[PDB]
């Protein structure tokens, strides 16, 4: 089978240059009609075609990105290299390479098979933020009742959240993180409890952020109002 | 913008047939071969169709493709729960001298009855207000299928400035949950009289409100 | 035979052919002053086979044929006799006993174009190699794989001709080169073209 693997940085500073390498096995870029393409996919968004390099060294690029994209190949090493300049936070995506088993051009007409074999993909994050531990705030029960705690303004991912040092598992759900305009991540974790246990049972969410060596605990209590 | 148009979502029951369409111009679909891709959650895409209607090795008869004029269609019959994934159309665009992907279509296999969401809107905590910050947290739980729309209003006026929203994720009871946040300054939280979190699910719109007056 | 030979209509032609459809011009009854061509440094390649380039003027031939086309820089080495490769096998073939000159020069300021010139073509697929001096300009669909094509383009069912894609900032190896191949006739019949 065909196997491609992308490699490169997983965190670049804004305005720096991203260099990605695609190493492949199972085919050759010396074969007539074969190319290697690049694709990216921001978190929760569509696939975006990026660039293609051709067995005959033809190069094609997405028009809105052509001035930032360079592509090259080394047939002897089974490698394709893509560089994207002037990286912005909106360029945070998972970057793929893939094999194009058939790509030919006759003046104005094209044959373009598509991408039959995709790589695993590598995730590149563009951020100027420095490592910061989260602040944790309680989401007091409104009065079944719902309570939780808000994990706010941390970088980078991830944080792990448990309740009562792992003693509370039933009715517990922790949401995926959001990236705010400030460049810092926020997250929530909620527990669904019977409203009759608000003044009896106690709830403590434990937040652990390994990058900043931060471990914080917060007690969620019903507000007197 | 996107030069290929797909419906954002499509749904059916197990065993039924679903079709996903893809419209473009003569610069792409009209004169070039269309390929379709499947992307399960958390993994790389996978080629389903090439040359408009051909299947690569390992793709069953359940998937078929067609192309007419400037539109392509992916058909999936005998739906299984394992077919839940995003589906994309792809082709070459002769005007752009580059390839293009459609916006993708999220297929939901309905193997569970409809469940209305549980909405809770938390005001800013006392500690956060002391820290000169403010965040409204609108949590949404126990709904199916996993598709909701969230809207924020301040004194009835539509708010979009401080809104962040997560894509719905599966709960441990196999239903779906989502969350939305409205980041405010303590002044903005005290300025407006009340705030609303409105959640729409399968046509039904529910809402919860909070107020700094309390 | 007082009139000079019109090599200007060959080397300074307005349009040059694609290599798969090379143009052949008949040359006869003229004074072939080969000295000015060999002297000009504007030629990247001036190889001779069977004759001496410095003794070209002192010679008479039964007839002279001039083949012109445009190829990529790193493909000029394939025009020489006894060579292999996509040009030597599928487009233009010189026999092992070739007698004549191979002249070529860089045309990046004429045949390139911002965004790429894709008008020049070469044959990328063919069932078999070319006979020496054979010209193949057919456009039938090539079956690369095992599935029959029925003249329908698709995967492994390919149009045989491919564009070059000359970019103005390509490396020299990928830049366009105009090539003139002077074939000299080895016939024992009376001569027709002579130098001064
Ligand atoms: C193929 O064409 C080239 C290009 O010239 C073209 O043809 C000539 C006849 C004119 O009509 C031009 O207008 C066309 O573009 C021919 O090369 C050219 O040959 C000329 C002699 O026949 C030569 O003229 C002078 O060259 C020397 C001095 O040139 C100096 O000054 C010029 C500016 O005028 C400059 O470009 C050049 O670099 C020198 O610095 C000298 O020997 C004489 O004074 C002579 O009169 C041209 O320079 C030369 N190149 C150009 C660009 O004009 C070529 O002969 C043709 N070959 C065949 C086989 O037909
Ligand atoms: Ni490039
Ligand atoms: Ni206002």
XYZ file of C-alpha atoms and ligand atoms in Angstrom:
697
model
C 0.000 0.000 0.000
C 0.773 3.678 -0.217
C 1.802 5.404 3.003
C 2.512 9.120 3.414
C 3.554 10.872 6.614
C 3.696 14.603 7.256
C 6.209 16.115 9.651
C 7.071 19.561 10.934
C 6.499 22.012 13.778
C 3.303 21.793 15.801
C 3.505 25.386 17.092
C 4.726 28.398 15.110
C 4.818 32.050 16.063
C 2.769 34.539 14.014
C 4.616 35.897 10.932
C 7.083 32.973 11.023
C 7.386 30.451 8.187
C 5.935 26.939 8.403
C 7.945 24.176 6.715
C 6.209 20.822 6.209
C 7.784 17.661 4.801
C 5.822 14.753 3.306
C 7.640 11.407 3.246
C 5.906 8.703 1.225
C 6.310 5.030 0.369
C 4.646 2.684 -2.100
C 4.908 4.859 -5.218
C 7.366 7.040 -7.116
C 7.185 10.676 -8.207
C 9.136 9.689 -11.333
C 6.007 8.005 -12.727
C 4.147 9.797 -15.504
C 0.949 11.431 -14.286
C 1.577 11.191 -10.527
C 1.629 14.123 -8.129
C 1.590 14.921 -4.425
C -0.963 17.353 -3.038
C -1.403 19.308 0.193
C -4.643 19.966 2.084
C -5.453 21.696 5.354
C -8.473 21.673 7.643
C -9.023 24.251 10.399
C -10.733 22.932 13.553
C -14.376 22.251 12.762
C -14.196 23.578 9.192
C -13.968 22.226 5.653
C -11.021 20.748 3.803
C -9.050 23.401 1.906
C -6.974 22.377 -1.101
C -3.526 23.985 -0.862
C -0.978 22.951 -3.502
C 0.170 20.177 -5.819
C 3.573 19.217 -7.171
C 3.798 17.230 -10.369
C 6.068 14.425 -11.573
C 7.315 16.811 -14.295
C 7.886 19.518 -11.625
C 4.735 21.474 -12.474
C 3.394 23.378 -9.477
C -0.157 24.543 -8.782
C -1.399 26.616 -5.854
C -4.633 27.891 -4.383
C -4.987 31.364 -5.881
C -5.653 33.251 -2.640
C -2.492 31.690 -1.129
C -0.083 31.506 -4.084
C 2.202 34.330 -2.942
C 2.752 32.494 0.374
C 3.212 28.901 -0.854
C 6.344 27.196 -2.167
C 6.475 23.504 -3.077
C 9.385 21.295 -4.140
C 10.258 17.614 -4.428
C 13.228 15.265 -4.141
C 12.401 12.120 -6.105
C 15.386 10.156 -4.791
C 14.341 10.694 -1.150
C 10.577 10.202 -1.724
C 9.890 13.602 -0.158
C 7.855 16.727 -0.919
C 8.387 19.983 0.992
C 5.765 22.719 1.400
C 6.555 26.110 2.945
C 3.899 28.667 3.895
C 5.123 32.138 4.831
C 3.660 34.759 7.182
C 1.636 32.398 9.359
C -1.500 33.818 11.053
C -3.612 32.318 13.877
C -6.341 31.614 11.293
C -3.839 29.266 9.616
C -4.169 26.917 12.622
C -5.232 23.669 10.964
C -4.457 20.005 10.433
C -2.234 19.730 7.356
C -2.392 16.681 5.081
C -0.468 15.418 2.105
C -1.936 12.936 -0.351
C -1.133 11.056 -3.541
C -2.667 12.132 -6.842
C -2.437 8.950 -8.950
C -3.436 10.794 -12.128
C -2.839 14.435 -13.047
C -2.280 15.526 -16.656
C -2.636 18.775 -18.607
C -3.185 19.314 -22.348
C -3.300 23.090 -22.936
C -6.668 24.028 -21.413
C -7.953 20.526 -20.605
C -7.039 18.665 -17.417
C -7.332 15.198 -16.000
C -7.302 15.253 -12.197
C -8.130 11.971 -10.463
C -8.287 13.465 -6.997
C -6.494 12.257 -3.863
C -6.662 8.486 -3.406
C -4.259 8.111 -0.449
C -4.075 10.625 2.398
C -1.468 10.979 5.115
C -2.165 10.888 8.833
C -2.084 14.685 8.997
C -0.148 16.962 11.355
C -1.748 19.718 13.438
C -0.071 23.139 13.320
C -1.091 25.864 15.775
C -0.130 29.506 15.179
C -0.087 31.539 18.384
C 1.922 34.272 20.094
C 0.548 33.247 23.497
C 2.872 32.057 26.248
C 2.206 29.220 28.679
C -0.407 30.169 31.273
C -2.340 28.216 33.872
C -6.123 28.478 33.973
C -8.397 30.366 36.313
C -11.308 28.279 37.599
C -14.689 29.721 38.556
C -17.755 27.887 39.898
C -21.047 27.609 38.024
C -23.393 27.642 41.001
C -26.611 25.581 40.749
C -29.596 27.619 39.616
C -31.938 26.328 42.341
C -32.903 18.087 38.847
C -30.298 20.863 38.901
C -27.147 21.582 36.907
C -23.825 22.794 38.303
C -20.268 22.989 37.061
C -17.098 25.029 36.900
C -15.578 27.267 34.231
C -11.932 26.736 33.253
C -10.796 30.022 31.747
C -7.816 31.650 30.011
C -5.226 28.894 29.689
C -2.599 27.987 27.096
C -1.836 25.599 25.632
C -4.217 22.668 25.433
C -5.120 20.497 27.226
C -6.600 20.552 30.717
C -8.033 17.509 32.469
C -11.066 17.945 34.721
C -12.330 15.487 37.330
C -14.879 15.868 40.126
C -14.142 15.046 43.779
C -10.710 13.631 42.835
C -12.364 11.080 40.551
C -15.047 10.013 43.026
C -17.831 11.619 40.958
C -18.325 10.097 37.504
C -22.104 9.771 37.111
C -23.767 12.690 35.344
C -20.436 14.367 34.539
C -19.691 15.836 31.108
C -16.723 18.029 30.172
C -16.961 20.131 27.013
C -14.307 20.710 24.342
C -12.360 23.945 24.565
C -13.061 27.265 22.863
C -10.371 29.590 21.561
C -11.173 33.185 22.470
C -10.078 36.265 20.530
C -7.439 36.847 23.238
C -5.632 33.683 22.108
C -6.399 31.796 25.337
C -8.536 28.680 25.724
C -11.613 28.203 27.898
C -13.566 25.092 28.816
C -16.519 23.984 30.934
C -17.428 20.862 32.890
C -20.980 20.258 34.095
C -22.653 17.795 36.473
C -26.377 16.976 36.473
C -27.551 16.320 40.036
C -30.895 15.880 41.814
C -32.056 19.235 43.149
C -32.709 17.643 46.564
C -28.973 17.067 47.174
C -27.866 20.693 46.701
C -27.646 21.402 50.432
C -26.316 17.915 51.233
C -23.758 16.631 48.706
C -20.625 18.619 47.895
C -18.998 19.029 44.495
C -15.330 19.858 43.900
C -13.942 20.069 40.366
C -10.209 19.374 40.053
C -8.486 21.098 37.124
C -5.035 19.928 36.026
C -2.973 21.828 33.437
C 0.247 19.927 32.759
C 2.120 22.533 30.613
C 2.092 25.220 33.333
C 2.343 22.675 36.191
C -0.911 24.090 37.574
C -3.317 22.040 39.702
C -6.305 23.913 41.129
C -9.424 22.863 43.038
C -12.760 24.660 43.340
C -15.844 23.907 45.434
C -19.180 24.399 43.660
C -21.822 25.527 46.149
C -25.398 26.797 45.759
C -25.582 30.580 45.947
C -27.632 32.207 48.699
C -28.520 35.152 46.415
C -15.920 31.872 -0.689
C -16.544 28.287 -1.743
C -16.834 27.488 -5.453
C -18.544 24.154 -4.661
C -21.805 24.063 -2.697
C -22.906 21.178 -0.463
C -25.825 21.007 1.968
C -24.500 21.391 5.522
C -26.310 18.281 6.798
C -28.397 15.283 5.782
C -30.125 12.617 7.851
C -31.968 9.307 7.525
C -32.760 6.093 9.416
C -30.642 2.917 9.290
C -31.242 0.916 6.133
C -32.638 3.939 4.278
C -31.089 5.818 1.353
C -29.527 9.279 1.531
C -28.117 11.499 -1.215
C -25.592 14.334 -0.930
C -25.410 16.874 -3.751
C -22.606 19.139 -4.939
C -23.076 22.083 -7.303
C -20.393 24.061 -9.106
C -19.651 25.823 -12.391
C -18.485 24.624 -15.786
C -14.978 25.623 -14.660
C -14.915 22.696 -12.220
C -17.670 20.034 -12.138
C -18.912 20.830 -15.635
C -15.685 19.814 -17.378
C -13.643 17.855 -14.808
C -13.995 14.551 -12.982
C -15.598 14.572 -9.526
C -14.293 12.599 -6.548
C -16.003 12.053 -3.194
C -14.429 11.665 0.243
C -15.549 10.333 3.625
C -14.112 11.655 6.899
C -14.994 9.835 10.119
C -14.604 11.892 13.320
C -10.966 12.290 14.302
C -9.322 10.740 11.231
C -8.093 11.640 7.752
C -10.414 11.723 4.727
C -10.895 8.615 2.601
C -11.641 8.428 -1.116
C -15.112 7.014 -1.839
C -15.650 7.803 -5.540
C -13.468 8.841 -8.462
C -14.203 9.571 -12.124
C -17.768 10.585 -11.142
C -19.040 7.054 -10.479
C -16.159 4.580 -9.994
C -15.307 3.010 -6.638
C -11.754 2.189 -5.538
C -10.913 -1.213 -4.112
C -12.558 -1.780 -0.730
C -15.613 0.466 -1.220
C -18.897 -1.500 -1.277
C -21.805 -1.161 -3.692
C -23.626 0.899 -1.039
C -21.828 4.055 -2.239
C -22.487 5.359 -5.746
C -21.757 8.558 -7.623
C -23.327 10.488 -10.461
C -22.687 13.706 -12.352
C -25.006 15.737 -14.579
C -24.101 19.133 -16.004
C -22.503 21.151 -13.202
C -23.816 19.037 -10.309
C -22.640 15.808 -8.698
C -24.453 13.484 -6.296
C -23.232 10.915 -3.765
C -25.758 8.204 -2.901
C -25.534 6.000 0.194
C -28.020 3.145 0.646
C -28.530 0.770 3.554
C -27.283 3.266 6.123
C -25.331 1.888 9.074
C -24.423 3.740 12.259
C -20.760 3.532 11.200
C -21.504 5.731 8.175
C -21.854 8.867 10.338
C -19.155 11.178 8.978
C -18.505 14.334 6.996
C -18.642 13.899 3.218
C -16.877 16.129 0.691
C -16.916 16.581 -3.061
C -13.702 17.411 -4.867
C -12.589 18.251 -8.380
C -10.271 20.434 -10.438
C -11.174 24.037 -11.274
C -9.803 25.072 -14.673
C -10.220 28.792 -13.942
C -8.321 28.685 -10.641
C -5.741 26.184 -11.980
C -6.167 24.361 -8.672
C -8.317 21.813 -6.884
C -11.354 22.633 -4.763
C -13.305 20.933 -1.972
C -16.939 21.543 -1.144
C -17.971 22.732 2.278
C -18.720 19.178 3.406
C -21.951 17.489 4.489
C -22.446 15.955 7.934
C -24.464 12.732 7.751
C -26.526 11.767 10.801
C -27.846 8.205 11.097
C -31.035 8.452 13.179
C -30.831 5.498 15.559
C -32.504 7.225 18.510
C -35.750 9.186 19.036
C -35.801 12.970 19.144
C -34.927 14.491 22.524
C -35.431 18.131 23.446
C -32.460 19.964 24.992
C -31.990 20.984 28.615
C -30.801 24.599 28.752
C -29.155 26.293 31.742
C -27.821 29.865 31.600
C -25.305 30.727 34.315
C -24.691 34.381 35.250
C -21.149 35.589 35.998
C -19.840 34.133 39.240
C -19.059 36.364 42.210
C -15.330 35.613 42.000
C -15.167 36.437 38.285
C -16.862 39.789 38.906
C -14.293 40.524 41.618
C -11.583 39.639 39.075
C -13.031 42.385 36.806
C -14.311 39.806 34.299
C -17.738 38.489 33.329
C -18.850 35.424 31.372
C -22.327 34.091 30.663
C -22.268 30.306 30.259
C -25.164 28.714 28.357
C -24.968 24.922 28.672
C -27.133 22.615 26.548
C -27.591 18.945 27.437
C -29.512 15.785 26.571
C -30.612 16.493 22.999
C -30.762 14.373 19.839
C -29.904 14.665 17.015
C -26.670 16.585 17.606
C -27.629 19.825 15.855
C -28.551 23.071 17.636
C -28.446 26.816 16.983
C -27.662 29.361 19.711
C -28.449 33.088 19.770
C -27.590 35.765 22.344
C -29.518 38.969 23.032
C -28.901 42.005 25.251
C -32.114 43.957 25.935
C -33.558 42.187 22.897
C -30.691 43.248 20.603
C -28.735 40.496 18.806
C -25.274 39.998 20.315
C -22.412 38.403 18.382
C -19.321 40.203 19.698
C -18.366 38.015 22.649
C -19.986 34.755 21.558
C -18.054 31.485 21.367
C -19.794 28.162 20.763
C -18.631 24.545 20.756
C -19.640 21.912 18.244
C -22.060 19.417 19.845
C -20.353 16.395 21.398
C -21.715 13.044 22.544
C -22.715 12.596 26.175
C -22.130 9.411 28.155
C -25.836 8.572 27.679
C -25.259 8.796 23.866
C -27.237 12.048 23.643
C -25.497 15.303 22.700
C -24.338 18.366 24.620
C -23.132 21.820 23.603
C -21.975 25.038 25.241
C -21.885 28.736 24.398
C -20.188 31.666 26.116
C -20.739 35.431 26.074
C -17.701 37.347 27.315
C -18.533 40.744 28.826
C -16.883 43.416 30.883
C -18.497 44.007 34.293
C -19.668 47.379 32.959
C -21.448 45.801 29.978
C -22.962 43.171 32.283
C -24.266 45.934 34.564
C -25.292 48.263 31.716
C -27.930 46.112 30.010
C -31.067 45.146 31.905
C -31.115 41.433 31.031
C -29.513 38.841 28.757
C -31.018 35.867 26.932
C -29.701 32.563 25.590
C -32.022 31.207 22.889
C -31.550 27.622 21.679
C -33.244 26.248 18.554
C -33.518 22.492 17.983
C -35.609 20.876 15.222
C -37.710 24.021 14.846
C -38.422 24.414 18.568
C -36.892 27.512 20.182
C -36.417 27.679 23.960
C -34.692 30.361 26.002
C -33.332 31.178 29.455
C -32.677 34.661 30.823
C -30.516 36.222 33.531
C -30.236 39.694 35.022
C -27.652 41.604 37.087
C -30.561 42.812 39.233
C -31.220 39.191 40.303
C 23.558 29.036 -57.077
C 24.528 32.655 -56.398
C 21.661 33.128 -53.915
C 22.524 32.549 -50.260
C 20.765 29.812 -48.333
C 17.649 30.978 -46.405
C 18.648 29.714 -42.972
C 16.961 32.847 -41.619
C 13.564 31.325 -42.420
C 14.513 28.418 -40.121
C 16.389 29.924 -37.167
C 14.463 33.220 -37.075
C 11.014 31.768 -37.799
C 8.124 33.510 -36.062
C 6.578 30.270 -34.769
C 8.196 26.950 -33.879
C 6.460 23.591 -33.751
C 5.834 21.339 -30.787
C 8.330 18.494 -30.657
C 5.692 15.829 -31.310
C 4.792 17.591 -34.571
C 8.230 18.781 -35.664
C 8.415 20.936 -38.787
C 10.658 19.905 -41.686
C 11.876 22.435 -44.264
C 13.522 21.424 -47.541
C 16.869 23.084 -48.301
C 18.337 22.890 -51.799
C 20.230 24.811 -54.496
C 21.884 27.397 -52.282
C 25.161 28.602 -50.780
C 25.240 27.170 -47.244
C 27.547 29.449 -45.232
C 27.729 27.434 -42.008
C 30.538 29.622 -40.612
C 28.356 32.412 -39.189
C 26.215 29.933 -37.232
C 29.149 28.132 -35.587
C 30.655 31.529 -34.747
C 27.565 32.877 -32.964
C 27.720 32.470 -29.185
C 23.908 32.750 -29.055
C 23.719 28.969 -29.636
C 23.896 26.736 -26.571
C 24.476 23.551 -28.595
C 26.239 22.933 -31.922
C 27.022 19.217 -32.181
C 28.042 17.496 -35.413
C 27.886 13.811 -36.317
C 29.725 12.325 -39.283
C 31.176 15.724 -40.269
C 33.408 18.395 -38.767
C 31.669 21.669 -37.821
C 34.728 23.707 -38.828
C 34.871 21.903 -42.203
C 31.146 22.375 -42.893
C 31.654 25.038 -45.575
C 34.101 22.851 -47.547
C 31.358 20.240 -48.129
C 28.633 19.427 -50.650
C 25.580 17.272 -49.961
C 22.846 15.613 -51.996
C 20.176 17.540 -50.036
C 19.679 19.339 -46.722
C 16.679 18.956 -44.403
C 16.012 21.264 -41.441
C 13.864 19.999 -38.554
C 12.720 22.551 -35.973
C 10.791 22.243 -32.705
C 10.804 23.402 -29.071
C 11.794 21.229 -26.099
C 12.905 21.626 -22.493
C 16.498 22.478 -21.635
C 17.469 19.166 -20.051
C 16.006 17.357 -23.111
C 18.492 18.741 -25.662
C 20.851 15.885 -24.785
C 18.202 13.472 -26.088
C 18.274 14.847 -29.636
C 21.769 13.357 -30.120
C 21.864 9.935 -31.840
C 21.660 6.702 -29.880
C 19.782 8.287 -26.962
C 16.690 7.277 -25.000
C 14.084 9.169 -23.008
C 10.622 10.571 -23.515
C 11.706 12.861 -26.364
C 14.042 10.410 -28.101
C 11.529 7.557 -27.793
C 8.136 9.240 -28.264
C 8.702 12.495 -30.174
C 11.894 12.880 -32.240
C 14.414 10.127 -33.007
C 17.791 10.402 -34.709
C 19.284 7.186 -36.125
C 22.600 5.786 -34.948
C 24.134 6.555 -38.366
C 22.942 10.169 -38.251
C 24.937 12.637 -40.351
C 24.329 16.314 -39.660
C 24.212 19.049 -37.038
C 22.129 19.612 -33.905
C 21.726 23.306 -33.061
C 19.762 24.692 -30.111
C 19.446 27.910 -28.123
C 17.574 29.291 -25.126
C 14.219 30.907 -25.937
C 12.985 31.837 -22.454
C 12.412 35.445 -23.568
C 10.227 34.227 -26.473
C 8.493 31.017 -25.356
C 7.839 31.641 -21.649
C 4.985 33.636 -20.145
C 3.992 34.978 -16.733
C 1.787 32.316 -15.197
C 3.286 29.720 -17.531
C 3.149 29.011 -21.258
C 1.278 25.727 -21.735
C 0.889 25.759 -25.518
C 3.926 23.631 -26.432
C 3.242 19.905 -26.258
C 5.169 16.645 -26.202
C 3.985 13.045 -26.480
C 3.968 11.413 -23.037
C 2.456 8.002 -23.855
C 3.007 5.682 -26.801
C 2.678 1.954 -27.425
C 6.205 1.696 -28.849
C 9.273 3.798 -29.585
C 9.641 5.917 -32.708
C 11.416 4.904 -35.876
C 14.236 7.349 -36.716
C 12.735 10.486 -38.307
C 9.188 9.191 -37.749
C 6.516 11.792 -36.953
C 3.500 10.750 -34.858
C 0.739 13.353 -34.512
C -2.171 11.056 -33.638
C -4.341 11.851 -30.618
C -5.938 8.497 -29.781
C -6.586 7.696 -26.130
C -3.761 5.703 -24.533
C -4.637 2.675 -22.394
C -2.199 2.910 -19.486
C -3.995 0.332 -17.329
C -5.870 -2.886 -18.000
C -9.414 -1.543 -18.416
C -10.387 -0.775 -22.040
C -10.856 2.914 -22.768
C -13.253 2.942 -25.757
C -11.840 6.385 -26.521
C -13.083 7.786 -23.191
C -10.626 9.775 -21.092
C -10.288 8.657 -17.493
C -7.999 6.988 -15.003
C -5.301 5.144 -16.983
C -7.166 6.289 -20.138
C -5.098 9.298 -21.126
C -4.729 11.819 -23.887
C -1.225 11.113 -25.250
C 0.052 14.721 -25.319
C 1.203 16.737 -22.296
C 1.931 20.446 -21.948
C 5.400 21.706 -21.044
C 4.607 24.615 -18.730
C 7.446 27.074 -19.346
C 7.733 29.579 -16.471
C 9.911 32.690 -16.911
C 11.669 31.953 -13.592
C 12.129 28.208 -14.063
C 15.610 26.823 -13.735
C 17.559 26.699 -16.982
C 16.923 22.950 -17.160
C 13.175 23.609 -17.372
C 13.358 26.600 -19.732
C 12.274 26.364 -23.383
C 14.857 25.716 -26.091
C 14.400 26.043 -29.843
C 16.190 23.292 -31.767
C 17.162 23.104 -35.449
C 18.393 19.723 -36.711
C 20.237 19.917 -40.037
C 20.211 16.485 -41.686
C 22.787 16.018 -44.451
C 22.075 13.604 -47.292
C 24.512 10.717 -47.777
C 23.309 9.783 -51.269
C 25.767 8.997 -54.063
C 23.734 11.156 -56.483
C 24.881 14.600 -57.701
C 25.101 17.272 -55.025
C 22.562 20.058 -54.479
C 23.666 22.150 -51.466
C 27.244 23.411 -51.205
C 29.129 25.845 -49.031
C 31.191 28.770 -50.345
C 18.387 36.095 -36.869
O 17.989 37.334 -36.335
C 18.964 37.912 -35.463
C 18.298 39.084 -34.775
O 18.297 40.254 -35.581
C 17.141 40.244 -36.443
O 17.572 40.227 -37.785
C 18.343 41.373 -38.196
C 18.741 41.129 -39.647
C 17.558 42.679 -37.992
O 16.464 42.728 -38.894
C 17.047 42.772 -36.541
O 16.177 43.897 -36.466
C 16.289 41.494 -36.148
O 15.855 41.542 -34.790
C 20.197 38.282 -36.277
O 21.182 38.821 -35.398
C 21.506 40.207 -35.700
O 22.416 40.271 -36.789
C 22.742 41.610 -37.185
C 23.592 41.503 -38.432
O 22.881 40.837 -39.467
C 23.432 42.345 -36.038
O 23.622 43.703 -36.425
C 24.910 44.212 -35.991
O 25.534 43.385 -35.004
C 26.815 43.866 -34.515
C 26.585 45.122 -33.674
O 25.368 44.964 -32.937
C 25.508 45.807 -31.822
O 24.443 46.719 -31.727
C 23.133 46.121 -31.693
C 22.117 47.251 -31.662
O 21.822 47.623 -33.008
C 23.026 45.195 -30.464
O 21.768 44.525 -30.489
C 24.164 44.158 -30.458
O 24.115 43.393 -29.256
C 25.539 44.810 -30.650
O 25.834 45.472 -29.409
C 27.808 44.066 -35.686
O 28.262 42.799 -36.146
C 27.169 44.851 -36.861
O 27.122 46.246 -36.571
C 25.797 44.312 -37.250
O 25.246 45.257 -38.164
C 22.566 42.297 -34.785
O 23.295 42.804 -33.672
C 22.128 40.870 -34.471
N 21.230 40.845 -33.324
C 20.197 41.677 -33.140
C 19.455 41.512 -31.854
O 19.847 42.499 -33.990
C 20.740 37.033 -36.963
O 21.774 37.397 -37.871
C 19.643 36.280 -37.734
N 20.138 34.987 -38.181
C 19.788 34.425 -39.342
C 20.391 33.083 -39.629
O 19.023 34.975 -40.127
Ni 6.484 26.992 -5.878
Ni -26.202 47.701 24.146
